[PDB]
């Protein structure tokens, strides 16, 4: 069995100069995984789902860093898909990141959520790539 950590996060800051479109905050969501691990060893790509109000609702990042820098006026629930090079399920993992912006004139919002994921039946090359990334076999 293989047990690997992941870390999702986002930041949001009030725009000092509101734009003509009416946007008041700048927000960035990023998937980086745990501390000091090249996720690319086992993640083929990452998919970011944005509110349809944004143009190009579906963003794709095929190499790290995996991110979506954007501007807006309101938050939402943002789906994220992390697809691995796994040869069998789990081949993809879905998260529902609560993307929220800082209102109430508080200091800018910064959020980090840590999660744990499981893979089964790892092969020798699978274990090799996980150890390249630092994954731990349990």
């Amino acid at each position: 069995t293989v047990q690997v950590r992941l870390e999702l996060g986002h930041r949001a800051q009030l725009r000092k100069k509101p734009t003509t479109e009416g946007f008041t905050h700048d927000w960035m969501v990023f998937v980086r995984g745990p501390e000091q691990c090249d996720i690319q060893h086992f993640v083929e790509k990452v998919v970011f789902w944005l509110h349809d109000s944004f143009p190009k609702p579906r963003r794709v990042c095929k190499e790290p860093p995996y991110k979506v820098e954007e501007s807006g006026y309101a938050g939402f629930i943002m789906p994220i898909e992390v697809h691995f090079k796994n040869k069998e399920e789990p081949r993809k993992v879905c998260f529902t990141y609560d993307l929220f912006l800082n209102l109430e004139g508080n200091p800018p919002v910064n959020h980090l959520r840590c999660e744990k994921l499981t893979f089964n039946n790892p092969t020798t090359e699978f274990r090799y790539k996980l150890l390249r990334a630092g994954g731990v076999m349990v």
Binding site: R11, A12, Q13, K17, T20, D26, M28, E35, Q36, D38, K56, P64, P65, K67, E69, N102, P107, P108, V109, N110, G134
Partner: protein
Amino acid sequence: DTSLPTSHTYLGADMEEFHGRTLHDDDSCQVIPVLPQVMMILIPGQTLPLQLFHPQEVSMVRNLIQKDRTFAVLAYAQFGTTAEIYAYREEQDFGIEIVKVKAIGRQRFKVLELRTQSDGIQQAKVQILPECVLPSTMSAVQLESLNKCQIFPSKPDQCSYKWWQKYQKRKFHCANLTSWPRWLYSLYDAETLMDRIKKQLREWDENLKDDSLPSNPIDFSYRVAACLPIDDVLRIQLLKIGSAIQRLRCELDIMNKCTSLCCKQCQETEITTKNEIFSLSLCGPMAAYVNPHGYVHETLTVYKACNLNLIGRPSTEHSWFPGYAWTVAQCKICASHIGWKFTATKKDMSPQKFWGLTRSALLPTI
């Protein structure tokens, strides 16, 4: 003006500066921290600006400024480049202790081991690679009686066929003592290769000053490699080469061969051609800049771009080039973020427009 872009004023106005130099002797084993968010292949002499926001990277950079002001950037690894911090500033941004720094690539190295740490400061066991300096190719084939005729009166027809023919005839007169002609030895001479590379650069930039380029073959070669629109594999090959002459010859070969840059996503759409490249910065046509969120892009400046489309209205909120407003630009075929178009805020400014394309989205083609 061409000095403004290198100032990186968009980051901030005042930042503590450290003018000291930290060097590591050759073939010496070191233990160096590794920055996790830098995948760039830092070349010696290239400026790396960063805006660290991670809770632990702030602590690591604080320890670095406390001691030795140096970290590592792996050639994402078996090779990497050390970066020496030279500008520093703290701020409270995004609700976090954010640290804005500027460093310079200093030394190449080979990776021996990568060991993690409890705090997360990945320590690399580092071997400092050397700079192989060779004497003149005529050093072994020389006549003492002619040692006087090795320093030439001046370097003023002039700066053309005359001076260079005389240079070849005088400094490589002993080729006849060997089985090889003088013009062969001319191909392994630092001065001639540097002059040819300078001719190519001047072809790129008609407003190029000789004083702007280093007179040292090593520094000149590193600057040339830093300013070429090339891929990652060639960057690694250039870093691996330890002899200045070999690097200069490789750079000349690349410059001769390279013709155009295509969309790294489409792979068949051309965006720009090497003849349209131009330098708006003393650093060179290509330089590294950070976006508002702290991530780094290598931008190359051109007069014109092909198959490009713009989004938004030019703004000067965080422009990398003062006096210019940026509009996000992308390849119209696929909309991938290729770069931006910079337009003049004033009307009496030269040029009135140009483009800056991120190297991370450009694929050179031959």
